[PDB]
Amino acid sequence: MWHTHSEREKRVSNAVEFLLDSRVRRTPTSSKVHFLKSKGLSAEEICEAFTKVGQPKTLNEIKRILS
Numbered sequence: 845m846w847h848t849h850s851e852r853e854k855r856v857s858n859a860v861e862f863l864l865d866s867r868v869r870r871t872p873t874s875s876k877v878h879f880l881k882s883k884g885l886s887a888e889e890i891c892e893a894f895t896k897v898g899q900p901k902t903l904n905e906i907k908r909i910l911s
């Protein structure tokens with residue numbers, strides 16, 4: 845029993861709040877991407893979150909930060 849979809853959108857929703865934090869917004873992209881990876885988001889979920897806050901990032905640029 846996985847509940848794959850619910851845990852995915854919980855991670856993204858928490859990520860959106862994080863990325864909207866007024867202090868977090870003024871930190872570099874690499875710092876935010878590493879933070880979200882440490883909370884269990886995949887690169888694809890990190891990409892979804894950046895689009896949802898209106899600062900879209902490419903999948904490759906996220907993967908390149910994390911590789």
Ligand SMILES: O=C(O)c1cccc2ccsc12
Pocket residue numbers: 885886887888906907908910911
């Ligand atoms: O899913 C990730 O977080 C991820 C991160 C970095 C590289 C690659 C390549 C395939 S997935 C992935």
